[PDB]
Amino acid sequence: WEIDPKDLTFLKELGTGQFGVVKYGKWRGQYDVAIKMIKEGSMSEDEFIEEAKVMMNLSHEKLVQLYGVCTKQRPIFIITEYMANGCLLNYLREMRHRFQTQQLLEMCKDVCEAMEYLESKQFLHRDLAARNCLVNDQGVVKVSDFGLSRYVLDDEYTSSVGSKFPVRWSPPEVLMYSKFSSKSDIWAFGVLMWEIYSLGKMPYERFTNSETAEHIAQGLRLYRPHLASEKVYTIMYSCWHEKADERPTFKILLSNILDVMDEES
Numbered sequence: 001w002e003i004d005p006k007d008l009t010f011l012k013e014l015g016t017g018q019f020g021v022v023k024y025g026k027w028r029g030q031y032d033v034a035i036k037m038i039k040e041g042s043m044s045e046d047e048f049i050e051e052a053k054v055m056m057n058l059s060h061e062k063l064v065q066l067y068g069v070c071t072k073q074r075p076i077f078i079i080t081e082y083m084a085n086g087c088l089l090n091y092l093r094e095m096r097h098r099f100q101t102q103q104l105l106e107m108c109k110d111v112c113e114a115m116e117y118l119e120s121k122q123f124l125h126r127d128l129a130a131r132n133c134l135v136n137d138q139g140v141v142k143v144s145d146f147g148l149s150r151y152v153l154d155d156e157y158t159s160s161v162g163s164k165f166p167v168r169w170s171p172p173e174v175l176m177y178s179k180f181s182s183k184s185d186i187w188a189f190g191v192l193m194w195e196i197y198s199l200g201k202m203p204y205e206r207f208t209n210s211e212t213a214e215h216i217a218q219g220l221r222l223y224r225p226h227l228a229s230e231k232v233y234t235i236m237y238s239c240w241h242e243k244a245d246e247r248p249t250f251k252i253l254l255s256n257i258l259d260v261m262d263e264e265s
């Protein structure tokens with residue numbers, strides 16, 4: 001579980017997030033890694049460390065791999081697989097890629113495989129969104145930072161009325177009662193498909209968080225991105241049923257996405 005930080009060589013800053021700075025570097029002079037330098041006061045560290053033992057065992061080709069942690073001194077480090085093309089959201093926003101719809105659906109499949117694996121292990125992501133997926137040098141999309149939301153100390157992130165809370169990715173039962181389940185990840189995944197087909201537009205871009213919560217409680221939904229076929233829109237919409245138990249599983253979504261790939265090759 002433990003990595004010796006002296007085996008790390010730091011090379012470039014990648015960005016700053018909920019837990020502070022993240023860097024790109026090498027492990028033992030040779031292996032690409034991303035290193036989260038956890039900003040003091042920003043994480044429930046003891047709980048996270050206990051949980052990292054479980055997370056180490058979540059291994060899937062479409063999940064960013066946790067390699068280990070450096071706990072001896074602070075800041076603590078989280079060491080992970082490095083993704084050369086950065087976050088899916090910024091990748092979608094670079095219009096130069098001029099992705100074909102088949103590539104867009106492959107991105108959704110990549111995420112849906114990861115989530116189906118997590119669902120099979122009864123492990124929630126809790127903050128699924130394009131900003132929390134990453135792209136490797138082969139253009140493969142992987143799911144990042146699953147479950148880490150549980151260790152954030154910042155009330156602006158955790159409170160449902162907080163400035164940083166993922167309101168636009170949340171189902172009504174989440175906004176109304178904090179009922180979190182595999183079905184809240186499903187809802188978020190549909191929003192994520194919408195992000196992908198919308199090339200990274202903000203969901204409900206003309207509404208505030210408050211306005212979004214009220215409209216989805218009334219039954220308003222996102223609508224079809226121009227790049228989504230009717231079949232693709234159907235899949236994303238299915239994630240948004242008002243009743244959580246009527247939303248599909250990731251296993252079902254996966255077969256649906258595979259069928260659509262077969263029908264719109």
Ligand SMILES: Cc1c(-c2nc3c(-c4ccc5c(c4)CCC[C@H]5NC(=O)c4nc(C(C)(C)C)no4)ccnc3[nH]2)cnn1C1CCOCC1
Nearest residue numbers: 014015016017018022034081082083084086127145148149
């Ligand atoms: C950014 C970039 C990468 C690149 N980044 C990475 C990162 C990575 C992951 C997260 C994050 C960053 C980097 C950074 C900030 C957000 C941050 N989020 C968190 O830490 C965080 N959130 C959460 C919750 C709130 C969901 C619970 N928990 O933890 C990891 C691996 N491989 C990478 N590869 C490659 N190129 N680039 C540009 C591309 C063009 O410009 C140069 C760098």
